[PDB]
Structure formats: C-alpha cells, structure tokens
Amino acid sequence: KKPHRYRPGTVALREIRRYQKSTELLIRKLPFQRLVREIAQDFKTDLRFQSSAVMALQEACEAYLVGLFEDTNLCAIHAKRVTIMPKDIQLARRIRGER
Amino acid sequence: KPHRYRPGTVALREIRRYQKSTELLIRKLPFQRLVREIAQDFKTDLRFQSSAVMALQEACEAYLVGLFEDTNLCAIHAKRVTIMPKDIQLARRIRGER
Amino acid sequence: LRDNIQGITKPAIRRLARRGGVKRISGLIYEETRGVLKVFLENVIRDAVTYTEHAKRKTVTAMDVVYALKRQGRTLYGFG
Amino acid sequence: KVLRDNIQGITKPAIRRLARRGGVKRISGLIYEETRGVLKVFLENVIRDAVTYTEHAKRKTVTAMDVVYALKRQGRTLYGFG
Amino acid sequence: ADADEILQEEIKEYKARLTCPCCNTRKKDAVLTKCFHVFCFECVRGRYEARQRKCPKCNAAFGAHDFHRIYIS
Amino acid sequence: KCDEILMEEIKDYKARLTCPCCNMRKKDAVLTKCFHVFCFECVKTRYDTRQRKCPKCNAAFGANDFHRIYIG
Amino acid sequence: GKARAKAKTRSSRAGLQFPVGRVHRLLRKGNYAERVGAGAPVYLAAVLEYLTAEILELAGNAARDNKKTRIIPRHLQLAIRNDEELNKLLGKVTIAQGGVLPNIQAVLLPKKT
Amino acid sequence: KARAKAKTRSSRAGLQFPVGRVHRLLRKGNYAERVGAGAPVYLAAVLEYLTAEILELAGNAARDNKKTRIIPRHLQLAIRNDEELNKLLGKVTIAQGGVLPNIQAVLLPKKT
Amino acid sequence: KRSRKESYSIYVYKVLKQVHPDTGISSKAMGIMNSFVNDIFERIAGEASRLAHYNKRSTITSREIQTAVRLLLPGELAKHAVSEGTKAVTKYTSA
Amino acid sequence: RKRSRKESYSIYVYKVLKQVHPDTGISSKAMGIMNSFVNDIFERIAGEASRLAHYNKRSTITSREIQTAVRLLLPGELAKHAVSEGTKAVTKYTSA
DNA sequence: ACAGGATGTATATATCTGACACGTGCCTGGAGACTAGGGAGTAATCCCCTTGGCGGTTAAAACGCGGGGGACAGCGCGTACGTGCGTTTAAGCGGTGCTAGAGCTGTCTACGACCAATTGAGCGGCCTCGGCACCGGGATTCTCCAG
DNA sequence: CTGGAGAATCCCGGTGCCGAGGCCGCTCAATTGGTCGTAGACAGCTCTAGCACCGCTTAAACGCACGTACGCGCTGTCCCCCGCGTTTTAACCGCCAAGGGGATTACTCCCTAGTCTCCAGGCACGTGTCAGATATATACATCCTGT
Ligand SMILES: [Zn+2]
Ligand SMILES: [Zn+2]
Ligand SMILES: [Zn+2]
Ligand SMILES: [Zn+2]
C-alpha cells in the first residue's frame, strides 16, 4: 500500500548532485555525430571527421550548454523564479554577447 | 501654480539627450584625480599624458554604459524598471567579471 | 541526414541543465536550446571547415576543431 | 602629494548620466556605491596593466599607448588614440 | 589582590574548556574528523574498545580512522 | 616567589593555544596532514599566498586538510 | 643597360588605393612569418581597402542625414552600430567620442492613458 | 679536442622544464628576430612553476578523492577551487573535467 | 632630427573621395579609421601567421590571407572581401 | 613507411609531478590536459613578450619581456611567485 | 517536532584488466666552442609638455522637500511540469571489410630573400577659407492638469 | 477626450573661428633589376583510420497519468526615488611658469644568430603488473508519511 513517490524537486536535486559529481557526456554520441555531420555538410560536401574531432565538438558543446544553463538559472533566480524559461536563455545569451 | 513633470518623463528626456550626445558624462578633474590615486597606489611618482587620461575616461564611460545597458536588461527581466545592485552583480557575473 | 536536432533529446537537455544546476525546466526550453546549440555548432563547425579547407584536407581533424574553439575564445584542453 | 577617496568624485549625477546613456529610467540609491566599486575594480585592472607596460619601457610617464595596449589586452579595444 | 583573583578566575575558566567533556578530569589530545569536536585520546580509545560509535558531544558516528591524535603544545 | 611561578605558568600556558606564526591570537585550525594546530586566518593566508605548507614541518596540505577546530 | 621603367607602384598594379608596399613592409617587420608571398600584401591591402570603403560609405551616409559634410566619430559609431555585420566584426571595440546607439526599451516608454 | 661533456640549461637553472626546447620554440614561433639567453630560462621557470602549482592542487584533490592517479576531473577541481588558477584559465574548458558541484541556495528544499 | 610617423590617413581619404566625392572627415574620425585599419591588419596577419604555423608553411601567401579573411570577417562581408582580394591578386598577376 | 617524431612536455610534467607528489600518478588524458596547458601558457607568454618587444621597438626578447608578460598575464599572487621563480632561475643560470 | 520505513548513500573485501610506469634502442635535436656583427645600454642634450598655482565665474553638484508611482508581500488559481511506470526506440558495443585520404618522400623549379641605385610617394610645416560651433529668435511639439 | 498653458526642442539665419585640406619642400623607403637558395607544389606510394553494415542487448527515450507547486495576475500598502528650486562648490578656462623626462644622437661592447661537430635526452616501442572499476555485504544520512 501507498507506493513511494518523491516530492517534485528532490529527484531533480538528486540528478543535479549526480550530474555535478560525474563527468561523462550527457548527450548520446550517435545523434550528436549525425547533427555535426548535417551542420558540416552545409559548408563543404563530402566531408570526413576524425573521431576525436567529434568528441572535441561534443565536449565543447556540453561545456557551453552547461555554462549557458548556469547563467540561465541565475537569470531565472533573478526574476524570483526557480524554473528556467526561454527568456532566461535569451537574456543570458544577450548579456554574454551572442545576441 | 507650479509646473511639474510626472516621474519618468524627465528621465526619458535625459535618456534621449544623452543618447543623442557624445560628450564625456563624468567631470574631467575628479576622474583624473581618481586615476592618479589608483596609479600612485600601484606605482608612486607617476606622470600621465592628457591623452592617456582622456583614453581612460572614454574606456571607463563606455564600460559603465555597457554595464548599465546589461543591468537595465536584467532589471526588465525581473519585471522592474529600476536597476538594483543585484542587477549589476548578475550582469557582471554573466559577463564573467566575477 | 535531415531533422536530427531533435536527436538532442529532451532528457539530454534536461541532463545538461542538471549539470548546470537547474532544478525546474520549462517545456519551451528544449526547442530554444536546440536552436542555440545549432547556432553554436554552425559557428564552430564553419571555422573548423575553413581550417580544413586551408590545409587542402578533406578530413576535419581534432586540431582544426581546437583551433576553431580557440579563435572563438573557447579554448579546449585535451585534444592537442 | 597623495590622493584619497577620489572615487567619490565620480558623483551621483555623473552615474545618473551614465545610466541615462545606457537607457536606464529609474536608478536605486544603492546603485551609486556599487558603480563606484565596479568602476574602481575596472580602473585598478586597466591602470595596473598600463603601469606594468610603462615600467617595462623604463618610462615614468604613462602615455596613451600604454592605456591602449592595456585595453586591447582585456578585450576592450579602444579606437581614436593610436 | 583583585588582579590575582581575576587571574585565578581566568585560569580556572581556561582549564574548564581545556579538558575533555566526556571525562572532565584530564586534557584533550584528539579530535573527531566527522563532528569537528576536540576530545581526549584515552576517552576515544575507551569508547572505541567498548563498542560505542557515538560522539560524546554530538552523537555522530565515527570509526577507527575517523579520529587521530593532534599536537597542541 | 609564588607570584613569579604564577607568572611563569601564564607564559607557558598561553603559548600552546596561540598560533606559532602569528603569535597574538588563539589557535582555531588544525591540519590533517601533519596533525598540528594553528589558527584559521593564518592558514587561510598561507593557502592564499600559495605557501601551502606547514609553518614548522613544511608538510604540504590541501584546502580540505585544514578546518575549524574548537579547543575553546 | 640602364633602360628601365621609371616606377610602378604595386597598388596601381593591383588597382588599389591602399599601399601594397607598406602592407608588405609591415608584414615583414611584424614577425608574422619567415617569408611573405608576393600576393599576400596585395590580398591584404585589397581586403583592408574594401573594409575601409564599406565603413566610410556607411559613415558618409550617416553624416549626410545630419546635414554634415564631414565625418565625425559619432557618424562612424552610427554606421558601425546600425550595420549589424560590421557591428559584430567590431563588437569588442569601443569608439572614442562616438556615443551610443539611441534606443529605449519598449516597456520603459510611457503607458499613455 | 678537450671540452665539457654536457650540461643542459634546464640543469644549470635547476629546472625540470626544458630551457633548450623553449628556446627553440621561441625562435621558431616568429616572436622576435632575436631571443635572449635568459628568456627561455625565465619562461621555463614560469612554466614549471605553473605546472607544479596545478599538479600539486590536482594531486591534493585526487588524494581527497581517495585516488592516487590524477584524472581530468581532479585537474578541473584544482582549477575551479583556486580563484587565481580559475581566472588564469577562465575561458578554458577541460575535457572530461565535469563541473564544480554547487547548488543555488534558493533551489534547496524549504524544510517545511 | 625630426620624428616621423606613418598612417593610413591619405589612403583612407583617397578611398573616401572615391566613395563620397563631396564629403570630408575630421582628425578624430581619421584616428578612428587608422586604429580600425591597424586592428584589422593585425587580426588578419596574426591569423595568417597562425595558419602558416599550423600547416608548417614558412611563408604567408594569398591563401593564408584568404583563409584568415574567411575566419575573421563575418558572412557577406567576408564574401565580398574574399572577392575583392582575389580580384586584386588576379589583376596584379597580369601586371 | 618510416616512423614520425612528435614533441611533448609529458616527461617534464611527470618529473614535476614526481618532485611535488612522489607517490601520485597521472592518467594519459590528464597528461594531455597538462601538455595543452603548458603549450597554451607558453604561446600566451611568448605572444605577450613579442608584442612588448614590438611596442618598445626592440628586436630581442630578453628576461625582462618575459618578466613583464608574466606580470601581465598571470593573475594576483601567481604573478609574483612566478616572477620570483623566474628571477631565481635566471640568477642561478647566470651564476652557472 | 518527532518514529520509522524506505530509499539512497558511504565503507570494507576479492578479482580482472587494460593503462600506466619503467626498460631499450635509436637518432636527431639540443649542447660546446668560437666568430662576428648588430642591438641595445649608457652618457648627453634639448625641448615638449606635464604638473602646479592663482583668479573669475559659472555650470554643476548637493541639499531638502513633496508626492506618486513602482517594489514587494500576500493571496488565489490553474496549469504546466515533475515523478513514476509501462512501452518502444535506437544507442552502444563488437566485429568485419573496404578504401579514401592522411601522411611521408623524392624532384625541381619557381618564387622569396638579399642587395645596389634611385626616385617618387608620403610626411612635416604653412596657410587659408569655409564647415561648423555658437547666439538668438520664432515656430513647432511634447507633457499635463483640468475640466 | 481634448483645450490650452507651460516648457522643451527644432529650425532658420547671421557671424566668427579654428582646423581640413591643399600646397611646397625634402627625404627615405618602395621600386627595379638582377642573383641565389630553398619552400613548396606535385607526382607517387603506403597504410591508418574513417566509413558502412550487420546483429544483439539493454539503456534510454517516449508517451501517458496524476498530482502539486509555482508562474502569474490582482490587490493593497507604503515608502523610495524623481522632479525641482536653492545654495554651494569646485570644474573649467585662461594665463603663467618651472623643470622632468621623452625623445633623439653618438659610441662602444657584449650578446645572440650562425656554423660545425658531437652525444645523450627524449621518443617510439615493448612489457610486466597493479589502481581500479566492479561486484557484493554491511552500516549510516536523508525523504517522506504519519501523528
Ligand atoms: Zn576525555
Ligand atoms: Zn561531536
Ligand atoms: Zn595564526
Ligand atoms: Zn606541521
């Protein structure tokens, strides 16, 4: 009786702790491989990629997106919110200088 | 009967007149004294070219104006029209200054 | 190869946000995150492909990627 | 002669004007002190780099060249001074 | 006379917290690394041998390698 | 001669709970590596000045090797 | 024999206003590479001249609508900031006496009831 | 025909890092048409000091992690836990280093 | 003797009179222009030097400058700059 | 097909590690991180010293240009300790 | 605020297993030794130009006050998102196989450095007039209260 | 919902001023024309690794149910910042004046490129073996329900 159910947020905090304690790639390797190949074929058709080049691109994108989500979370907390919304990412990117 | 403008309208007029204009918005001698104070904190018995102090004033004014633009965007993000020290801190930390 | 930006799945973006210390994520976050990731990849990959083209190579080496990242002020360690 | 507390010389209306150029409508009363602090930090960094450049050149006068190189070092390239 | 009385009072107060609260007889020479409290090494071996892994101060669990002698003097 | 012995107790007692390097204030830190006791702000200054060794045995210690201690 | 051409600047050979010779000298003394090709100063001078022409065209356009027949740093700043592509080329660059681009956030405008 | 056997400039300056390799790279990197004799010694000393600092911090992190082998995670912790070393490498990302574990205080449970 | 200094002032003015025959320029604007030209020259030349070092080339050619222009200049500006540089190099080769 | 040749700071980083942590090893990925770090800082110092020599119209890079480049690039107290180590090495090299 | 039930996490032992640390053979890149020539350190000079003071004055800062409009706490709601579960997808791992292109090597030639003579472009100084700064006055436009 | 009054701003015209631009003189660096060396383009070969496919397993993505907590709108209240007038103050301009040191020149010397020979430091490869994941087995720190 009464199956266990964690309250909304504590599981999220446990994932935060787990993924900040760990170092592996958080994006599946084959879809990111395919995405890199699509974005590359728009610049030079019939292109080949070193495997380490794709791992370097994946590391760069994971680091960039993690830092962007750090700034996004700070923007959301600034607006007295705990959820991140697209306007948070827009503000963070525009202050960082992309927009 | 005295005449008063409602708050914000004169502020908008200043925004317009200081975005149309290009002169330095900080008094020259106080900024020069601040520069010399920091420099003598770094190296004593130091001389400054006038062009060096003017270059520092342009750089500092540009940096502060950009910081206030980002701070204003932070204020608008928090559904506010006034800027607060937390807005400056958030903008600076997102820009990587903290 | 078409329409694999959704291959960067919703749970993957959630995991990236979790590493970034994000407790709650909106449902509209994922599409806009996919867009900004696409923009970032466009910039980096374009620079890497330019570096590859200069070398008269048809293979994008890891060194081209790290040079492209370094030029964008995003220096990466561990690939040369 | 030595100089003290000239950061207060960057007065409240000056910060008002700087924020007006930045398109700021309302300004909190605590903005001015934080602006003085961040301007002081920026000036410390730039002036330290310029003084280091001057010391390398065996010079005892800080030229505009030293300021320009110190700014271009910090990703804050300045035009109109050489 | 007042200065001597004050000196004796502060000496007694200093001896009060210089001593292990678990024993209150003789000086501390060790700490517990999981509760950040200072105890005496003979009290901690007494608690270790008799199989009570409870801190005398905060009741935090600790083991053999969770405490060590420290150099005061 | 009681007061002279009384004063001799003061100099010996107050020396062992004060930081041997700063020597004006009470020890409130302990190193894990060499298991010696110092004060917290001195060990913070030594870590911040990148002199991350014990003041007397020169044992290298990490950021987590030193922490607050409460002698009292 | 002493029969030789009088002079022919490499800028005029490439049809450029910018100096191919001075760009080549700056490349040599800049310690960029051990050697500098013949066409490298030509290409670099052409690129620099194109960028100069673009920014000067935009600056003159900005000066014309202010009833000014003389480009000032304000006109250059307006030209660079209006052109988002030159703006992104010179994003981390500040211009002395240029001011800022006039804009106000739409929410800061009066509600006008 | 009599001459000294060998004495590397790294050994002369008491440096582990190669003064000769740094000198060669300074000449071949097109930095100046001349490079002084003491410039590679100074640069090797600075590089060795920075290497020793980052390696000592990484080894301390590894020991606190009960690991006797340095991994990129330990290097990342060493960089991010030292503010000077962090802002020296502020615009630098480390492969497989992860992130410094932090959670914003507002995200913690309300304890209600 | 007398101090001598070089600048792109006459070149910038010739370009201006080519693009805007009846427009002037101020001393401060000319300083802005000279700083811009030196900055872009330094960026392109440094990038070309890096390309030569990466590819082990000991010389900077028009290929290095073209790659540097493609890397640094954004989008359509880079396209036009590459076209202009190629045009000038082909014109120079004939003469 | 002969064997090529590649240069690295791997053995130097290992010597420094063994003299700072005698009984601690380093992985290959961490060694790659370290080699990239050494290369990056080397090129950074060398570029700053090259620009310093160019600004002063000097044709040579001496220990003073590296001094100034370290004082500029390295932050805070890292700068002064690196200056101390560099001057120590230069003095001991000139002595011997 | 306090049990306890469950969930998750932190310590304590076998056990493989590649990766890492150490040993060997080269070999080519640093070291020794010596020359020569230019870069720069040093002494001297001189003339910008930076610093310092004094005085007028006047624009700007500082002060104080009235009030209004924005910040913030609190409330209510409703819906969007988190958590868990069953289902489905495709990622991942390994294994094979093919070959395209990275990488290296030998020719050699055609560019780039170097150098002597020179001359025309480009910079410093002069001077002038006109684009623009400034003053003033009227017309226009924006703001705000009060109907 | 505007009328109208007050205030800010734009536009028009007249006048002076200082700097933008053209001109002149000079000088030094870019040009021309050779030689010579060697950097790289260019063909050829090798073989590394990039790509493609296949199949099985299972981790993970996905779709759905359901609840809840938080994002957002509304209300009140309240107090802090804006507008504005007055007083002070010190910024700013002009002028004067001294001398500090930036900039340039001349001389010399010593420090570094360049060379040649040589050898050993470091790299590529090989190989033992041992932290180290990777399991279980056991003992605490939270999470949440419940009272
Ligand atoms: Zn006891
Ligand atoms: Zn305790
Ligand atoms: Zn102390
Ligand atoms: Zn010790």
Residue numbers in the entry:
A (entry chain E): 36 to 134
B (entry chain A): 37 to 134
C (entry chain F): 22 to 101
D (entry chain B): 20 to 101
E (entry chain L): 929 to 1001
F (entry chain K): 904 to 975
G (entry chain G): 8 to 120
H (entry chain C): 9 to 120
According to the publication:
Ubiquitination of lysine residues is a major histone modification that regulates various genomic processes such as transcription, replication, and DNA repair. Histone H2B monoubiquitination (at Lys120 in humans) regulates transcription elongation and DNA repair. In humans, H2B monoubiquitination is catalyzed by the heterodimeric Bre1 complex composed of Bre1A/RNF20 and Bre1B/RNF40. The three Bre1 proteins share a C-terminal RING domain, which is required for the ubiquitination of H2BK120 in humans and H2BK123 in yeasts.
As the sequences of RINGA and RINGB are highly similar (with 86% identity), we were unable to assign the orientation of the two subunits to the density. Thus, we created two atomic models of the RINGA-RINGB complex bound to the nucleosome based on the obtained density. In Model I, RINGA and RINGB bind to the acidic patch and DNA phosphates, respectively, whereas in Model II, the two RING domains have opposite orientations. R953A and R978B (Bre1A and Bre1B residues are indicated with superscripted “A” and “B,”, respectively) in Models I and II, respectively, form salt bridges with H2AE61, H2AD90, and H2AE92. R955A in Model I and R981B in Model II also form salt bridges with H2AE61 and H2AE64 at the position of the so-called variant arginine type 123. K962B, R979B, R981B, and R982B in Model I and K936A, R953A, R955A, and K956A in Model II face DNA phosphates. In this model, the lysine residue closest to ubiquitin G76 is H2BK120, and the distance between the Cα atom of H2BK120 and the carbonyl carbon of ubiquitin G76 is 8.6 Å. Thus, when the wild-type Bre1 complex ubiquitinates H2BK120, the catalytically active RINGA should bind to the acidic patch.
